[PDB]
Design a protein around this nucleic acid. Structure first.
Lengths: 122, 65, 359
RNA sequence: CAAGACGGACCAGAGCGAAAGCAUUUGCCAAGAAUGUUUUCAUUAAUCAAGAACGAAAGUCGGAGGUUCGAAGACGAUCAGAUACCGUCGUAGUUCCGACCAUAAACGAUGCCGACCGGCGAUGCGGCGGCGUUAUUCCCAUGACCCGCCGGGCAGCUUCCGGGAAACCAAAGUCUUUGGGUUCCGGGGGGAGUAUGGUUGCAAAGCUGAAACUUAAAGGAAUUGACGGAAGGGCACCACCAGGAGUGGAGCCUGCGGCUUAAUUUGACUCAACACGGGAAACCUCACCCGGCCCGGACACGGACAGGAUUGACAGAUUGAUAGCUCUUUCUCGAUUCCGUGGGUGGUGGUGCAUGGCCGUUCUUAGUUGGUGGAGCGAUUUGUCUGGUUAAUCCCGAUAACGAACGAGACUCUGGCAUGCUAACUAGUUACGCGACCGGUCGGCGUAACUUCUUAGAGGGACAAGUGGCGUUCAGCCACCCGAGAUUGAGCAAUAACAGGUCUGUGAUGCCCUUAGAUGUCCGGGGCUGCACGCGCGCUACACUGACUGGCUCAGCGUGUCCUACGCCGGCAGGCGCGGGUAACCCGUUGAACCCCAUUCGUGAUGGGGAUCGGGGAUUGCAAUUAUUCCCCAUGAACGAGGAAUUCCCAGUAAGUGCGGGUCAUAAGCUUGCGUUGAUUAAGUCCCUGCCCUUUGUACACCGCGUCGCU
RNA sequence: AAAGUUGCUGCAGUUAAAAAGCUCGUAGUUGGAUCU
């Protein structure tokens, strides 16, 4: 049918990997800037590279890419990665604990903690 | 490409036993013709120029020149 | 290094006014000169004392370096299937412990290739002619006269049979004129015959794995059995005298070495055509009822006109009525007979369905 | 009711026994391991020639009883050859008592005793300690449970301890860093556990046990896959479905066989020969046949030769031939030579199985191979996949692999699009004017523009691009908008191969054969085409959707120094004159055919269709006899849609229709291309055939050729 | 001699040739610590 080969896919991959900024989801804007960078032969190779670039940046909007690796990841995933909640989930007001663990704490000279609540294994 | 890169040259040599045929197919390289090699590259190779490392924006600077 | 999708470092290149500097443009030409290592040494005659020179720089006879270069050059004269490499460009000091093993391998490889090539080279018919000559010398046939008809599957030869001097009470009478049908065993076109052979219960277990020669022998045996069944029912057919492998000898239909004309080639009158149609219908009814077989190849060529009588031949493809395609073959034969009779002007010839119902 | 049998299900990698073996309740008799022991002896032990007890099944003597099953034996089926095979009966045996036999794949294919070296938790027995649960909450111990621990067992799981040729083993480890104790036993494969001897047994047979001779291997692990007919998957109008055109049914042409011939050169013989060898041959071609001519035998040696080696030759004879080819005729010619010895040339003369090159085929496929890294001693393996994906090992993603290269793709030519660009007196239009005819037509004439039509160069354009579904929501697949095109047709074509064709294409060619009444050259004629018959392409038709005639009206490749216009004579074929064109300039605006309208013929072997045959005419050629072709009357035959079988094809396609080129002095029924008219069906499969591709196994085992004869 | 293919040094015995069907047992062979 119509399956893109090794050369066009690898070229589109390295075109995504570096020069990611100057291209875009619009098709023809990619076309010319491919000519502005890669000294490419025929226009059938060019118009086939510029097709997979648009088809790959449409795929970027669905999340990560398993084949490329640049440490930019839009500007939202960086914002999503350094999310900090207002209250720590670790400073819990009360914790349910096994008596064996409390025995370990007492043996550890840490027997005077106040946030602990000993529960029984019913 | 097989028309202007490889240089096929068949020759016949005559020995005591008979005739031996010789084929020598030498593929020309790139680096356009400073007396060596054809101009146009192989119609598949794409070479990508790395970008000039540009200055990232820090402060809006208006310099009159 | 060799990838098609490549990267260019042009922007990081700083200064290049004169790119074609005369430092990388060294003209390297050493082939036609005397500096190429790929050149004969112009060998010196062998010393008799066994060494060259004297003192401490005495270069001896074998002189492991020299002998290694010599063994490399002797490798250069190996078999074409051997692969050496670049053993002269790189100084290869190869020893007899290694070179003799490689030489033995080259000899074994060339010898086994020669053995494979020699095994490859070691891979009416003459056997049928020898069988016919043996039958003629045995007194069964006096002389092979000629070929009467040449078919696609078998060849029919008219011949004169011999007079057996053995006074046996059970000896079959040899006819004066005989027809020998020899099945063609060198033709691969006989492949659809399994449609009429595998469906027979008398030979399915044997034709399930039979060779083509065995298939031809089984077909000849089936033809002889069909001829015997037709002769037992009184149907007009050639009487088989003896069958040998793929050659079956039967009674010739005709006189003075002239075969009987076919129904298509015989210009019979209207009454003669009606009599021939009636005789064909009677023979078909006798074959369906008494012989319990369907000819399945009944046509104008299969029926011969002789002495005002219709004789049936080529019963090799005949099958019993119990076969899964016996009824369809009988209907096709009846349709062909009806078409042949209607073409001859027989107004009394019944239709294909009527002939199938009557038979 | 009786007779003997056997204790299933409970039955587990559980238990016991020295092993063989050992499952119905209860009782009796002695045994026995493990455990527990601040019990008793105190080295009493481990392994063991001789010797001894036990030793499954089968077998052997005596007795008993005999259900069932059953060697032997008796039936019946089954066939080219069954005597193995299957179903029915049935003796010894299988059952118990008392004596022999003492052999098994009697196996863990792993002697016994002792120590050490990783871990884990299940199970049986005994013992120890307990959060706690149950005997209708048990009144306290106690059995059935749970959580551990110890000893001794049958096993298991995991590991890069270690070992091994490896499979594998926690013992097969603690082994060239080689010694805890002890018994048996092996020394290449057969002969052979055979003969002989001894001994046991009633016997069958057991134990012990060679030699002669013969053989260079036999044997053990592991790796790749030839090969599977073993299986599924997959692809193909050189396969199928649905169909169209047919072929095979006639006539003719051509090719290949056979039959003749002086010769009817020659190769090629399923696809991968048979309108192929540019192979449509009057001579040539031409190799073949029937006969002639010449040396066009270089060069070296020797002889002849100047007092001539010779060449050529008029006239007559011969001769097809002004063939001195030979004789007569005697004229020429100045070493240009001749005769043998040598060896050179010329071969379309032999070997494509000695070769190169070229081409064809497997295959127009779907593979091929390194580098670095991992595993293994190594052969080798991963990369080169579970799956999905595509025309594609084309791709995605898993992933001890990561990246590559060749092939496919990209590329190149052609086609569809550009009212944007370039610019045309060797292309075209429009306008104006000049006319000509009745504001319309002019391919009928000239200058203003102009590039839409025509040319041919650059650039652009189309990418699964956008949308909706499907998707392992990746890769990509169906449908739709817009667009000229959501996409044609070819060229090139990998690794590994084929005894595929070609010496007959070469002044390519090795060994050669011949070389002067030549297998060399040339000439004359014949033949390649000869015909009882067979096999393949191809062309005409079988009539009405047709044929005849008249009128009408549109191309494209693309040749041409021969292509031809125009005028004249002829009915045509042709002939004469004057021109142009070495070429978008001329033929030509290429007034092509099928097709479009009208007339006549109306189902009739008919005027359909023109095979065969006579006569005449013209051209090309030295030469048309074997009709070279072309033209005109006449003759009008098979053939009324074709058996078995079979070919090709998916969209400007198949079919129908003609034009150009190649061959060509003379010429296309062939072929290479080109337009014109223009469809049906399907868009799906393994049903035939062919080719794949993955998995598993994987480097001819055995039972069923003889009788006699004399020296 | 290579032959570690005669093995005391110094071979082997699950699958390549090979551990007796099993147990007792005499001769043989080897035998816990412990006395300056």
């Amino acid at each position: 049918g119509r399956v893109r080969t090794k050369t066009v896919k690898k070229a589109a991959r390295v075109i995504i990997e570096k020069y990611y900024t100057r291209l875009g989801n619009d098709f023809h804007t990619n076309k010319r800037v491919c000519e502005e960078i890669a000294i490419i032969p025929s226009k059938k190779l060019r118009n086939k590279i510029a097709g997979y670039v648009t088809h790959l940046m449409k795929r970027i909007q669905r999340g990560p890419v398993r084949g490329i690796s640049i440490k930019l990841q839009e500007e939202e995933r960086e914002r999503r990665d350094n999310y900090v909640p207002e209250v720590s989930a670790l400073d819990q007001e009360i914790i349910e604990v096994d008596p064996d663990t409390k025995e370990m704490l007492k043996l550890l000279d840490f027997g005077s903690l106040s946030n602990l609540q000993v529960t029984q294994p019913t | 490409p097989v028309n202007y890169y490889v240089d096929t040259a068949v020759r016949h040599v005559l020995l005591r036993q008979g005739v031996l045929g010789i084929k020598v197919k030498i593929m020309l390289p790139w680096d356009p013709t400073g007396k060596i090699g054809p101009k146009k590259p192989l119609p598949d190779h794409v070479s990508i120029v790395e970008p000039k490392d540009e200055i990232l924006p820090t402060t809006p600077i208006s310099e009159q020149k | 290094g060799d990838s098609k999708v490549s990267i260019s470092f042009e922007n990081y290149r700083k200064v290049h006014p004169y790119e074609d500097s005369d430092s990388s443009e060294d003209e390297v030409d050493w082939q036609d000169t005397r500096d190429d290592p790929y050149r004969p040494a112009k060998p010196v005659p062998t010393p008799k004392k066994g060494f060259i020179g004297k003192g401490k720089d005495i270069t001896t006879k074998h002189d492991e370096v020299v002998c290694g270069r010599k063994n490399t050059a002797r490798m250069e004269n190996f078999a074409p299937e051997f692969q050496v490499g670049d053993g002269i460009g790189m100084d290869l000091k190869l020893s007899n412990h290694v070179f003799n093993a490689l030489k033995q391998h080259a000899y074994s490889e060339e010898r086994r290739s020669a053995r494979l090539h020699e095994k490859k080279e070691h891979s009416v018919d003459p056997k049928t002619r020898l069988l016919m000559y043996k039958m003629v010398n045995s007194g069964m046939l006096e002389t092979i006269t000629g070929c009467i008809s040449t078919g696609k599957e078998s060849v029919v030869f008219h011949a004169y049979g011999g007079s057996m001097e053995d006074e046996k009470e059970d000896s079959k009478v040899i006819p004066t004129e005989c027809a020998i049908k020899v099945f063609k065993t060198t033709l691969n076109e006989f492949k659809n015959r399994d449609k009429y052979i595998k469906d027979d219960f008398r030979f399915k277990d044997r034709f399930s794995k039979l060779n083509p020669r065995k298939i031809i022998r089984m077909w000849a045996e089936k033809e002889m059995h069909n001829l015997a069944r037709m002769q037992r029912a009184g149907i007009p057919c050639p009487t088989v005298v003896l069958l040998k492998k793929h050659i079956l000898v039967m009674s010739f239909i005709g006189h003075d070495q002239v075969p009987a004309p076919k129904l298509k080639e015989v210009k019979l009158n209207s009454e003669e055509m009606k009599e021939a149609y009636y005789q064909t219908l009677h023979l078909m009814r006798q074959l369906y009822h008494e012989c319990t077989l369907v000819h399945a190849d009944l046509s104008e060529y299969n029926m011969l006109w002789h002495a005002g009588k219709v004789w049936l031949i080529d019963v090799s493809q005949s099958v019993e009525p119990t076969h899964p395609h016996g009824l369809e073959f009988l209907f096709r034969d009846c349709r062909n007979v009806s078409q042949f009779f209607q073409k001859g002007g027989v107004k009394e010839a019944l239709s294909e369905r009527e002939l199938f119902n009557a038979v």
